[PDB]
């Protein structure tokens, strides 16, 4: 049906709240085609709401040392930022934080834990 | 319950530590003989034997039977005593007794008067002398360790803690809803630098333990991390990724003036100080997968110093400046390896999963690092020659840091 432009933003945010994670390859920090549509929806939202900022989380797997794992975390959030920047989102609206391997989603040493910890999360 | 030895060195030097004579009714709060004995077994240099195999249990060096000891192969005996005051404080006494001869000769003597709180320190104090007296190498039993504990719940899951080197006298330094990283000791032992994410972004700060106050040192855009105090304490090194990548900086603590150590588009982090406090060892990927590099804070161009293995990070330089201890990764696995800085001979010290964050005791005898078990991480111990392995225990523990002498 046709909605009020108010709960239209509500439903919109819900989609942005739900699907804010870009998953990465092992040691790979390039954005896949799957999240393009996803990020293109984040971008359109952000530059329509100039006074709203997103923070991108950077995450690496257990392998490596915690301090150097920061490096892999930042470049993954940088690709996300750059993609949104290409779509027109201002640097003003974005800041990135890399945690390295400090905040896992899953625990263990199975690849299942690894693959889902190799992520880039967008928090509003 | 005491530290767990995983791999005991059977060739350890036999020593007999005798239960100290408690001069009073009931029991003493602490037993010095039980702690001092463990400490020497903890060091991995000595093999203290149980009371069942002791020919005697004397208090003073005048009741010693040398022949009864050298027959066991014990060449020295530690006798002691505990005398209470009328204040709830106590007097500790000890003697190091040589059994190789006609007379039971004393090598060391001391008396300590302490309150009940400081009783373990007394055993540590005795140990630091006896160990040093026998070996010539200064003991590190009156040292501490600083670690981070991650509980999987509560309002405050992240805690920076400190205990005695053996895990006793544990207390919390910082409780944070958000993660804490990489605690680093000051050369005295009164201050500690670490990274805290309480604001939402990373921050590098310094807490004076005695009062629990906070000095903010760096909160630049992007990660502020990896603190290292120079052995003299004059300046602190760290890495900032504000530039676009992690590169090293050093700060003159007194002035507060800030200087850039490293120029790169590459990543340079995890700084470890050389004994001169003019040279830094650190991790760098200027060559591709990261290796450990060396540069002078004054001036110079970075050189690779790790020449064995495909990947080497997170190194700690020994105080005397003789060797390196780092995370050597080859073909998926990673273990704590030691490197002779003159010889070049690289030796893997560990067999465990995902070894990282190693630290070196002030006398460069022992290594404490972090290993992964199950869903959590545990602190580990390994002698610098790898002949002695041990375990160390709440929630999973990380980021061990060993105190300087104190």
From Swiss-Prot, chain B:
Cellular localization per UniProt: Periplasm
Gene: tolB
PANTHER family found in the cross-reference section: PROTEIN TOLB, PROTEIN TOLB HOMOLOG
Keywords: Cell cycle, Cell division, Periplasm, Signal
Function: Part of the Tol-Pal system, which plays a role in outer membrane invagination during cell division and is important for maintaining outer membrane integrity. TolB occupies a key intermediary position in the Tol-Pal system because it communicates directly with both membrane-embedded components, Pal in the outer membrane and TolA in the inner membrane.
Keyword Nucleus part of the UniProt annotation: no
Cell division listed as a keyword: yes
An example Gene Ontology CC term for this record: periplasmic space
Family recorded in the similarity comment: Belongs to the TolB family.
Single Gene Ontology BP annotation: protein import
Gene3D superfamilies: TolB, C-terminal domain, TolB, N-terminal domain
Name of protein: Tol-Pal system protein TolB
Pfam families from the UniProt entry: PD40, TolB_N
Complex and partners: The Tol-Pal system is composed of five core proteins: the inner membrane proteins TolA, TolQ and TolR, the periplasmic protein TolB and the outer membrane protein Pal. They form a network linking the inner and outer membranes and the peptidoglycan layer.
InterPro entries from the UniProt entry: 6-blade_b-propeller_TolB-like, PD40, Tol-Pal_TolB, TolB_N
């Amino acid at each position: 049906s046709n909605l009020s432009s108010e709960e239209q933003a509500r439903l919109q945010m819900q989609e942005l709240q739900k699907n804010n994670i870009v998953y990465f390859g092992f040691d790979k920090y390039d954005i896949g085609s799957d999240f393009a549509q996803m990020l293109d929806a984040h971008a359109a939202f952000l530059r329509s709401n100039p006074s709203d900022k997103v923070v991108v989380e950077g995450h690496a797997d257990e392998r490596g040392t915690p301090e150097y794992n920061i490096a892999l975390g930042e470049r993954r959030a940088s690709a996300v930022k750059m993609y949104l920047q290409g779509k027109g989102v201002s640097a003003d609206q974005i800041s990135i934080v890399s945690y390295g391997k400090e905040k896992p989603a899953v625990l263990g040493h199975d690849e299942a834990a690894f693959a889902k910890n190799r992520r880039a999360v967008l928090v509003y | 319950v005491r530290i767990e030895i995983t791999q005991g060195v059977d060739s350890a030097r036999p020593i007999g530590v005798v239960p100290f004579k408690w001069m009073g009714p009931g029991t003493p709060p602490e037993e010095i003989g039980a702690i001092v004995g463990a400490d020497l077994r903890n060091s991995g240099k000595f093999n203290p034997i149980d009371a069942a195999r002791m020919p005697q249990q004397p208090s003073t060096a005048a009741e010693v039977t040398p022949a009864a000891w050298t027959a066991l192969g014990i060449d020295a005996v530690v006798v002691g005593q505990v005398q209470p005051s009328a204040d709830g404080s106590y007097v500790v006494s000890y003697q190091l007794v040589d059994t190789s001869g006609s007379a039971g000769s004393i090598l060391a003597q001391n008396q300590y008067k302490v309150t009940k709180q400081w009783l373990r320190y007394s055993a540590h104090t005795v140990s630091d002398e006896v160990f040093e007296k026998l070996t010539g190498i200064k003991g590190a039993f009156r040292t501490r360790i600083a670690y981070v504990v991650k509980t999987n719940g509560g309002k405050f899951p992240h805690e920076l803690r400190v205990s005695d080197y053996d895990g006793y006298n544990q207390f919390v330094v910082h409780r944070s809803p958000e993660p804490l990283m990489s605690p680093a000791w000051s050369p005295d032992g009164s201050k500690i630098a670490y990274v805290t994410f309480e604001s939402g972004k990373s921050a590098l700060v310094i807490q004076t333990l005695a009062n629990g106050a906070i000095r903010q040192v760096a909160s630049f855009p992007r990660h502020n991390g990896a603190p290292a105090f120079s052995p003299d304490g004059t300046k602190l090194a760290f890495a900032l990724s504000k530039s676009g990548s992690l590169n090293l900086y050093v700060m003159d603590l007194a002035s507060g003036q800030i200087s850039q150590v490293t120029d790169g588009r590459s990543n340079n982090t995890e700084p470890s100080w050389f004994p001169d406090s003019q040279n830094l060892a650190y991790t760098s990927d200027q060559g591709g997968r990261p290796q450990v590099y060396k540069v002078n804070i004054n001036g110079g161009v970075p050189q690779r110093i790790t020449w064995e293995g495909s990947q080497n990070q997170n190194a700690d330089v020994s105080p005397d400046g003789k060797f390196l201890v780092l995370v050597s990764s080859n073909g998926g696995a990673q273990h704590i390896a030691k490197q002779d800085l003159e010889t070049g001979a690289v030796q893997v010290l560990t067999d465990t999963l995902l070894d990282e964050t190693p630290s070196i005791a002030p006398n460069g005898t022992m290594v404490i690092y972090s290993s992964t078990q199950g869903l959590g991480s545990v602190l580990q111990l390994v002698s610098t020659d790898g002949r002695f392995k041990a375990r160390l225990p709440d929630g999973q523990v990380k980021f061990p840091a060993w105190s300087p002498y104190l």
